[PDB]
Design a protein around this ligand. Structure first.
Ligand SMILES: O=C(O)c1ccc(-c2ccco2)s1
Length: 282
C-alpha cells in the first residue's frame, strides 16, 4: 500500500513535524470578517478559530445570522459536513436552530463536556427523559428519547420540535467518549468502529442535510473524522485507489475551514486510521 509506504518513510525519518508545517504553509487564507464583528465576540469560543465568510453557515433570522460553523463540500467524494465549535452557554439555541434549518439527521461529538479540569462545551442536550430542554430564543424543544452507552461511545435518540409549527424530527447524537485528554489514541480501531456506526445510521447520506460535527474548537478531532471518512470513500470510488493523496484531500478541506488537524500527531493518526480502515475493506 502506497500511503502505508509514505507512512513508514516519514516514521523512519521522524519528519511528521516537517510534513505538518508544509501543510500549514500551503493552507488557504480567506477573509473571516463577519466572525470578527464586535456584536459576535460572545458567539466565538476561541479568538483564533473563525469560519471563512464564503463557507459560513447562516442562521435564518434577520437579527444576527452568525454562528461559528462552516460547510465543507467534497465535490468528488459527494459528501458534505458542517464543522462547528462546541456550543457556548449563549449559543446552544443557535446550535439547534442550525441543526433544524440545515435538515441534519446526525450530530457527532468528539469531546467530553469537561476535559483537563475545564469546560470544553455547554451541556447542550437533556440527560433525563422526563427533563426536556426548551430554547426560548429559537423556539425549539429537545427531549431525550433513548440512550445506548457502550465502552468507547454512546448513541442517543433525540426529538427536536419546532414549537412554531409543531413539526418534530428524530436527531441521532453520536458521542465518542474515550479520546484521551493528551495526544491521540494508540490504535484507530475504536475510532474506525465509531465512524462505521455513524455511516450505518444514514447520518452521512445525501437524503439528509449535512452531519454536524464538533469537538471544542471544531478543527482538530473534527478534522480527523471528516478527513478519514472522505479518504476511505474516495478509495472505494476511484479506479486506482493508490492515487488517494491524504495531504491533498486535507488542503482541499482547508479551503472551507481553517486549522483542520491541529498537530503532527493528529496528522499521523489520520494516516493510521485511513491505512487501517482501508487495510480492512481490502
Ligand atoms: O496503494 C494501495 O495498494 C491501496 C490503497 C488503498 C486501497 C483500497 C482498495 C479498497 C479500499 O482501499 S489499495
Amino acid at each position: 500500500m502506497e500511503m502505508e509506504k509514505e507512512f513508514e518513510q516519514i516514521d523512519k525519518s521522524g519528519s511528521w513535524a516537517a510534513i505538518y508545517q508544509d501543510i500549514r504553509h500551503e493552507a488557504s487564507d480567506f477573509p473571516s470578517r463577519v466572525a470578527k464583528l464586535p456584536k459576535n465576540k460572545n458567539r466565538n469560543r476561541y479568538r483564533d478559530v473563525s469560519p471563512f465568510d464564503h463557507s459560513r453557515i447562516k442562521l435564518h433570522q434577520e437579527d444576527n445570522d452568525y454562528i461559528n460553523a462552516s460547510l465543507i463540500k467534497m465535490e468528488e467524494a459527494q459528501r458534505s459536513y458542517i464543522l462547528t465549535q462546541g456550543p457556548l452557554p449563549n449559543t446552544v439555541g443557535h446550535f439547534w436552530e442550525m441543526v433544524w434549518e440545515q435538515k441534519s439527521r446526525g450530530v457527532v461529538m468528539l469531546n467530553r463536556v469537561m476535559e483537563k479540569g475545564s469546560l470544553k462545551c455547554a451541556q447542550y442536550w437533556p440527560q433525563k427523559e422526563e427533563k426536556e430542554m426548551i430554547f426560548e430564543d429559537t423556539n425549539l424543544k429537545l427531549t431525550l428519547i433513548s440512550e445506548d452507552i457502550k465502552s468507547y461511545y454512546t448513541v442517543r435518540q433525540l426529538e427536536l420540535e419546532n414549537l412554531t409549527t409543531q413539526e418534530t424530527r428524530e436527531i441521532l447524537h453520536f458521542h465518542y467518549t474515550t479520546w484521551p485528554d493528551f495526544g491521540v489514541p494508540e490504535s484507530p480501531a475504536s475510532f474506525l468502529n465509531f465512524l462505521f456506526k455513524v455511516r450505518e445510521s444514514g447520518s452521512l447520506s445525501p437524503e439528509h442535510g449535512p452531519v454536524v460535527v464538533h469537538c471544542s474548537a471544531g478543527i482538530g478531532r473534527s478534522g480527523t473524522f471528516c478527513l478519514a471518512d472522505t479518504c476511505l470513500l474516495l478509495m472505494d470510488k476511484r479506479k486506482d485507489p493508490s492515487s488517494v493523496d491524504i495531504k491533498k484531500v486535507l488542503l482541499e478541506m482547508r479551503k472551507f475551514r481553517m486549522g483542520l488537524i491541529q498537530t503532527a500527531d493528529q496528522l499521523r493518526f489520520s494516516y493510521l486510521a485511513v491505512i487501517e480502515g482501508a487495510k480492512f475493506i481490502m
